[PDB]
Amino acid sequence: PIYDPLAPSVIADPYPFYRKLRETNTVHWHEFLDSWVVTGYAECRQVLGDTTNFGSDFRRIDVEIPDTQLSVQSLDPPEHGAIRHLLVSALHEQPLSTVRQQFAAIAAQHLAELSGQPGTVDLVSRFARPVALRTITAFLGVPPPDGAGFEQWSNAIVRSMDAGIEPARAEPGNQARAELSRLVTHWLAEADERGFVGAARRAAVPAAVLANSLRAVLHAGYESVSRLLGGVLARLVRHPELLAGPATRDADEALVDELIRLDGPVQADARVCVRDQPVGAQLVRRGDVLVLFIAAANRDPAVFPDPDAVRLTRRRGLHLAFGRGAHACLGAGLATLQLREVLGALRAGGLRLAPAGPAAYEPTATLRGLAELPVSVR
Numbered sequence: 158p159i160y161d162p163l164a165p166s167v168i169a170d171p172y173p174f175y176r177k178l179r180e181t182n183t184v185h186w187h188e189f190l191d192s193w194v195v196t197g198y199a200e201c202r203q204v205l206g207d208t209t210n211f212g213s214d215f216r217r218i219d220v221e222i223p224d225t226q227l228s229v230q231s232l233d234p235p236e237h238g239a240i241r242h243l244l245v246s247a248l249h250e251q252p253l254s255t256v257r258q259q260f261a262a263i264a265a266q267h268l269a270e271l272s273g274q275p276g277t278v279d280l281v282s283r284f285a286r287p288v289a290l291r292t293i294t295a296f297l298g299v300p301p302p303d304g305a306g307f308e309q310w311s312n313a314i315v316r317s318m319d320a321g322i323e324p325a326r327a328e329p330g331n332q333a334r335a336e337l338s339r340l341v342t343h344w345l346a347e348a349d350e351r352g353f354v355g356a357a358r359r360a361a362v363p364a365a366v367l368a369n370s371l372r373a374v375l376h377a378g379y380e381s382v383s384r385l386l387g388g389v390l391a392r393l394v395r396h397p398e399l400l401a402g403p404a405t406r407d408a409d410e411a412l413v414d415e416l417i418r419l420d421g422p423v424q425a426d427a428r429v430c431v432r433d434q435p436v437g438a439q440l441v442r443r444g445d446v447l448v449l450f451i452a453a454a455n456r457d458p459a460v461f462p463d464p465d466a467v468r469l470t471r472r473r474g475l476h477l478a479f480g481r482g483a484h485a486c487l488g489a490g491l492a493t494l495q496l497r498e499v500l501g502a503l504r505a506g507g508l509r510l511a512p513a514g515p516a517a518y519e520p521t522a523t524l525r526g527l528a529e530l531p532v533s534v535r
């Protein structure tokens with residue numbers, strides 16, 4: 158193989174490896190994984206937006222998928238539209254003034270808990286994860302579960318996304334998916350009318366699709382926000398000058414766009430080819446699996462010159478960290494609002510967060526995440 162996606166040196170910093178792949182071929186056949194690896198921006202953008210020839214529902218290539226496992230992320234048009242519009246409608250019903258107030262208060266509270274800490278603190282377990290958990294459960298309108306236990310179940314699902322590389326990772330993910338399903342079932346039965354769960358219940362599609370899709374909102378919301386915050390904090394702690402900018406709404410728009418482009422946690426996004434189709438110069442055939450390395454696409458220098466740097470003058474609307482097309486991230490607006498509020502809380506907190514040891518990364522290849530981010534607080 159080109160490299161081991163779970164090798165420690167790759168996990169420590171995968172972007173040079175992505176770049177070597179991209180420089181050799183933006184659409185490369187990985188024979189041991191039996192998949193195309195797509196690292197070019199143009200090709201990833203093409204595949205994401207074409208659900209006619211590239212799908213997320215493996216039933217379209219004659220794979221058996223029981224009805225009880227269907228979900229918004231594994232359905233394609235036309236079945237995808239009903240549950241997708243249901244979720245968007247429930248999202249759009251949430252008043253943004255309240256959402257922003259909740260997100261800002263959570264971020265400020267967890268930062269204030271850090272003030273007065275004289276030793277080394279781990280920003281993953283002390284900020285990124287608890288903020289994400291309270292953020293997603295406030296949005297859902299449900300009581301937060303225990304943070305440590307919830308992180309353990311959720312982590313099993315994240316690791317299972319790499320089961321094609323390490324098959325032993327599949328089984329813990331399935332047990333964990335079942336646990337999160339029971340959690341979601343309890344919320345469906347008991348949640349207040351305030352919040353996203355109450356709105357989704359009102360809008361309601363097969364009950365299995367709704368429950369699995371809400372589980373997806375919970376897990377995707379928690380893990381994506383948690384891991385984005387960890388990566389962004391890692392960059393801010395090494396480059397505090399990023400927070401020393403104008404700090405106006407528009408200046409922070411550009412900064413947030415760059416932070417999501419660079420530190421968006423989704424490294425890989427898979428599709429199946431339903432009908433033979435060229436991708437770049439290559440012919441992809443019905444039945445082929447494609448892994449879109451969207452974090453690599455977000456460092457493609459043909460689109461992002463000096464790709465590894467924060468540059469505040471790039472054209473907006475280019476990065477693929479939220480996907481593109483029918484399956485584009487449901488929470489992209491919530492996530493940008495949330496990160497804006499974190500930046501604002503950091504600036505108002507007046508706290509200096511200096512490195513107290515290296516950023517340490519977890520052996521997760523699909524969804525990048527820090528295992529630990531040790532800092533001193535001054």
Ligand code: HEM
Binds near residue numbers: 375
């Ligand atoms: C509260 C925050 C979030 C929620 C509630 C959320 C929820 C979701 C949901 C439900 C989907 C599936 C959409 C569909 O298949 O139609 C999705 C897709 C996606 N999310 Fe988010 N997400 C959140 C934050 C984030 C963040 C912070 C990132 C990355 C920075 C992200 C990256 C993505 C990507 C790349 C996809 C597309 C996957 C694909 O191509 O199928 N999400 N998200």
Ligand code: NA
Binds near residue numbers: 325
């Ligand atoms: Na084992």
